[PDB]
Amino acid sequence: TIKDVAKRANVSTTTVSHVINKTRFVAEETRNAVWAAIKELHYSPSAVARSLKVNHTKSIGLLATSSEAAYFAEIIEAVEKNCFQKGYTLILGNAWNNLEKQRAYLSMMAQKRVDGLLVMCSEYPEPLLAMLEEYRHIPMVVMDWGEAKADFTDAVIDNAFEGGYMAGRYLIERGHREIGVIPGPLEQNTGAGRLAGFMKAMEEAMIKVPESWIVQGDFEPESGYRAMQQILSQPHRPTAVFCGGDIMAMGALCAADEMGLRVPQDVSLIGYDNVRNARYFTPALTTIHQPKDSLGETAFNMLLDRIVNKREEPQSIEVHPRLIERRSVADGPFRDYR
Amino acid sequence: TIKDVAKRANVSTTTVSHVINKTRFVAEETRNAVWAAIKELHYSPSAVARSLKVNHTKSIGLLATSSEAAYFAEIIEAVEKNCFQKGYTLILGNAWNNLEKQRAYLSMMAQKRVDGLLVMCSEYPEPLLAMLEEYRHIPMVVMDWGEAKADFTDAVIDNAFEGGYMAGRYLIERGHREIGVIPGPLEQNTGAGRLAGFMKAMEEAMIKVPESWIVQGDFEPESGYRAMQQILSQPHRPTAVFCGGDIMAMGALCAADEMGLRVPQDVSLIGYDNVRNARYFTPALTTIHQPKDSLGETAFNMLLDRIVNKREEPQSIEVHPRLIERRSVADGPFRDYR
DNA sequence: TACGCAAACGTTTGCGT
DNA sequence: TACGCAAACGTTTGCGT
Ligand code: HPA
Ligand code: HPA
């Protein structure tokens, strides 16, 4: 159809191209005519044709775990924002932690020839790790690892451990010694790593966490609900709880209130993520803020660089979690004695 | 590079193609050899090339308003799910209710030659309505209108009005007569239309809503926060409130609790949307459920049909909101007298 | 029987003059 | 000076035989 514009304007398609892309000087008169035709014919230059010659789709693929969850959604929206402002197209794909599902999206992606790949798979087993390598040719970066699990990628690291540690400390310095915890899946960084940072602070204080007091969550509110219950549903209960994710926390707040417990009057609660509306939780959730925006932007940028600047060597960039004091924590029994 | 496989297998690329796409019979021996080469060479057939000949990207574009908001996120995730199971690729784009931003994504989209277009722009002013028509050639459907604003599209309609009406009725039959309302933007369907359905029920009951009792929201929790405040922050206050969206409601729950008010003991609250975790609100939010999944799937399907079955004529499909009784509403003063 | 030739899809771009 | 020719990018597919 570019052919059709060239004719209507009586110029070569080469010309047409040049004016459309300002790739070389053209007579105004000529330039005009082209736009003229361009408009009447109602022209929309074909990207795929172009992509075919230039060799780049100017589109990036996001191999995500899921997009509904608050945590994720925010990250994603960050990424999309950046793509748009730098003219890239976002192809979103959720594998739900499913090998097949990943092998598929991964394949489709390579095929649609995405210029780069953003990865957020939560769990990374060897098998997944392998498929990924089969694509070391597509520039890509993973945004959810603790350390650098691999050499053929870029990685932005959250310091989830330093965060877990912050949370514990807070509780400690608040007067708490009987603390419980609902961690996220141990196969994730935000799971394992947050718990570890937490357990360090505990040990550093000679606080021991009774196993009856640590209940696995899955980041989903319901899991928070059940955990909380299980904890305060026992003879001896902690006076403070550290919840691996704000959304699970939201679920833990529900149960307490449902058992007639008072937060924080009866139970102090500290979360992790600092989701967009954790502030409007009841009560306003005190939590650890993960820089989701900076995490998105920072990944998109490494990707660009590798893309444009054709970087070959891996790179990792750390980001930093920080404490947000809201209203779900109260002084503990030992505040005064310190 | 298909050329490179044909050579390694000593067959024509035509052959190579045929085996890759099972488009015609091939000797096993031959078939094998092709796969053989296909693998060693580590082949990934180029989609863009293919798309270029066949004339279809097998990818759909989602021109959304925003993807962070719960309501939206869920819808989106629904759409994505369907795309994947029918082999389509999802290109996600947020215009944030910005004409330019829309004209851009719209353009990029046409250019990347998306097979179809899914639209969720919230507000549709004439200008936006016009740009859209410039693309009546791309098969597309809008998922957020009340009625059929246009002839060149398909439309799934939510019956938000029948929903608004349901909510009012509930409150009424619960014993309430002094009700307030925090509606969503009047320029949206889920805004205006929900309010209307509500106001009908009121009129049908000779209940009059004092203007001091209706405060505009923007679907964002903060707006809920402020509204609630403004309402219960006055001499004479309603005994029940109808909130246009669960997330705003979440914001209204926060304020009440912050003013030391009890929900529902002091104020009964009814929301709208039935977001994934409205159940884990405190208290568990009684609300109107919008079938988000069915809304996504139902749109993707109309789109497919128009796509594959090459349908030319518009079509609209209604979906139905329904009441979910949770724990934020209590009997009102007039329950017994009815 | 089972396969191959060559044109075409819509662009960009190296040389020209 | 300001522009045009033709090849190429990686596929599918109508005819062949
Ligand atoms: O994997 C996750 N899922 C949901 N919320 C989260 N917050 C941190 N990590 C996660
Ligand atoms: O436009 C909207 N935004 C957020 N939540 C909503 N729920 C219904 N409509 C909307």
What CATH number is given to the structural domain containing A14?
1.10.260.40
CB within 8 Å of chain B, chain A residues 149-188:
none
Closest Cα to atom 4, ligand 2: which residue?
B219
Tell whether B246 lies on the interface with A, counting CB pairs under 8 A. no
Nucleotide C4, nearest residue via CA and C1': B12
Say yes or no: B131 and B175 in one domain. no
How many other C-beta atoms lie within 10 A of the C-beta of residue A218? 18
Nucleotide C10, nearest residue via CA and C1': A49
Identify nearest nucleotide to residue B53 by CA to C1′ distance: C9
Q: In terms of DSSP H, where are the helices of A182-220?
A: 189-203
Whole-number Å distance between alpha carbons of A22 and A320: 43
Asked if the Cβ–Cβ distance from B91 to A90 is below 8 Å, we say yes
Q: Which of A57, A74, A100 is the last residue of a domain?
A: A57
Asked if the Cβ–Cβ distance from A80 to B93 is below 8 Å, we say yes
Q: Which of B39, B68, B98, B247 to substitute to test the interface with A, most A CBs within 10 Å?
A: B68
Tell whether B265 lies on the interface with A, counting CB pairs under 8 A. no
Tell whether A21 lies on the interface with B, counting CB pairs under 8 A. no
**Alpha carbon of A337: minimum distance to chain B alpha carbons (Å):** 31
Say yes or no: B165 and B21 in one domain. no
Q: How far is CA A99 from CA A54, A132, B43, in A?
A: 33, 11, 20
**Which residues are bridge partners to A59 per DSSP?**
A89
Say yes or no: A334 and A296 in one domain. no
> Which strand D bases fall within 7 angstroms of a protein CB?
2-6, 8-14
Whole-number Å distance between alpha carbons of B34 and A282: 62
Asked if the Cβ–Cβ distance from B282 to A257 is below 8 Å, we say yes
How many other C-beta atoms lie within 10 A of the C-beta of residue A40? 11
Nucleotide D12, nearest residue via CA and C1': B53
The secondary structure of chain B in percent helix, strand, coil, rounded to multiples of 5, reads 45, 15, 40
Closest Cα to atom 9, ligand 1: which residue?
A190
CATH code of the domain in which A128 resides: 3.40.50.2300
Whole-number Å distance between alpha carbons of B121 and B293: 18
Q: Which of B75, B88, B92, B98 to substitute to test the interface with A, most A CBs within 10 Å?
A: B92
Residue whose C-alpha is closest to residue B85's, from A79, A98, A80, A73: A98
Say yes or no: B128 and B32 in one domain. no
Q: What experimental approach yielded this model?
A: X-ray
**Alpha carbon of A298: minimum distance to chain B alpha carbons (Å):** 19
Quote the Cα angle for A303-A305-A309, to 5°: 135
How many other C-beta atoms lie within 10 A of the C-beta of residue A92? 25
Q: Are B219 and B290 spatial neighbours (Cβ–Cβ below 8 Å)?
A: no
Identify nearest nucleotide to residue B15 by CA to C1′ distance: C3
Copy the structure tokens of residue B337.
Answer: 């007298």
Q: Which of A282, A285, A293, A328 to substitute to test the interface with B, most B CBs within 10 Å?
A: A282
Whole-number Å distance between alpha carbons of A245 and A218: 9
Which residue of chain B comes nearest to A66, CA vs CA? B77
Closest Cα to atom 4, ligand 1: which residue?
A219
**Which residues are bridge partners to A179 per DSSP?**
A240
Say yes or no: B175 and B270 in one domain. yes
Q: Is the CB–ligand 2 distance for residue B122 below 6 Å?
A: yes
How long is the CA A19 to C1' D9 vector, in angstroms?
21
B113 — phi, psi (to 5°)? 55, 55
User: Is omega for the bond preceding B321 within 30 degrees of 0, making it cis?
Assistant: no
Tell whether A228 lies on the interface with B, counting CB pairs under 8 A. no
Is the C-beta atom of A194 closer than 7 angstroms to strand C? no
Is the C-beta atom of A21 closer than 7 angstroms to strand C? yes
Residue whose C-alpha is closest to residue B139's, from B301, B318, B297, B292: B301
Say yes or no: A122 and A176 in one domain. no
- 8-state DSSP, B214: B
Give B81's contacts in chain A (Cβ within 8 Å).
94
| Count of domains observed in chain A | 3
The secondary structure of chain A in percent helix, strand, coil, rounded to multiples of 5, reads 45, 15, 40
Whole-number Å distance between alpha carbons of B97 and B230: 27
- 8-state DSSP, B245: S
3-class SS of residue B88: coil
How long is the CA B32 to C1' D11 vector, in angstroms?
21
Say yes or no: A165 and A277 in one domain. yes
A153 — phi, psi (to 5°)? -150, 170
Whole-number Å distance between alpha carbons of B87 and B300: 12
Is the C-beta atom of A49 closer than 7 angstroms to strand C? yes
Is the C-beta atom of B13 closer than 7 angstroms to strand C? yes
Say yes or no: A113 and A41 in one domain. no
Whole-number Å distance between alpha carbons of B304 and A2: 29
Q: Is the CB–ligand 2 distance for residue B274 below 6 Å?
A: no
Say yes or no: B220 and B299 in one domain. no
Residue B189 alpha carbon, nearest atom of ligand 2: 9
Tell whether A74 lies on the interface with B, counting CB pairs under 8 A. yes
Copy the structure tokens of residue B110.
Answer: 């046409």
| Substitution candidate for ligand 2 out of B68, B72, B123 with most atoms within 8 A of CB | B72
Residue whose C-alpha is closest to residue B272's, from B158, B154, B176: B158
Sign of the Cα pseudo-torsion (A242, A247, A250, A252, in order): negative
Say yes or no: B315 and B196 in one domain. no
The size of the A-B interface in CB pairs under 8 A is 140
What is the residue type of A16? V
Query: Tokens 């937060």, residue?
Result: A263
Residue B327 exposed, middle or buried by CB count within 10 Å (0-12, 13-18, 19+): middle
Say yes or no: A277 and A304 in one domain. no
Whole-number Å distance between alpha carbons of B46 and B55: 14
How long is the CA B13 to C1' C5 vector, in angstroms?
11
Copy the structure tokens of residue B207.
Answer: 């209940």
Resolution (A): 2.7
Kindly write down the DSSP assignment for every residue of B129-156, as one continuous string: HHHHHTTTTS-EEESS-SS---SSSEEE
**Domain carrying residue A338:** 160-289+322-338
Tell whether A337 lies on the interface with B, counting CB pairs under 8 A. no
Among A111, A277, A282, beta carbon nearest to B47 = A111
Q: Which helix (H) or strand (E) holds A10?
A: none
Whole-number Å distance between alpha carbons of A175 and A290: 25
Q: Which helix (H) or strand (E) holds A46?
A: none
What is the residue type of A23? T
Q: Are B124 and B99 spatial neighbours (Cβ–Cβ below 8 Å)?
A: no
Say yes or no: A210 and A327 in one domain. yes
Residue whose C-alpha is closest to residue B219's, from B272, B165, B160: B272
Q: How far is CA A112 from CA A58, A265, B79, B311, in A?
A: 11, 55, 19, 27
Residue B98 exposed, middle or buried by CB count within 10 Å (0-12, 13-18, 19+): middle
- HSE of A149 in the Cβ direction (CA atoms, 13 Å)? 22
**Contacts with A1 (C-beta within 8 Å, 6 or more apart), sequence order:** A41, A43, A46
Ligand 2: centre distance to CA A324 (Å): 28
Copy the structure tokens of residue A212.
Answer: 């009856």
How long is the CA A111 to C1' C5 vector, in angstroms?
27
Identify nearest nucleotide to residue A52 by CA to C1′ distance: D9
Counting ligands in written order, the one closest to the CA of B72 is 2
Residue A220 alpha carbon, nearest atom of ligand 1: 4
Tell whether B98 lies on the interface with A, counting CB pairs under 8 A. no
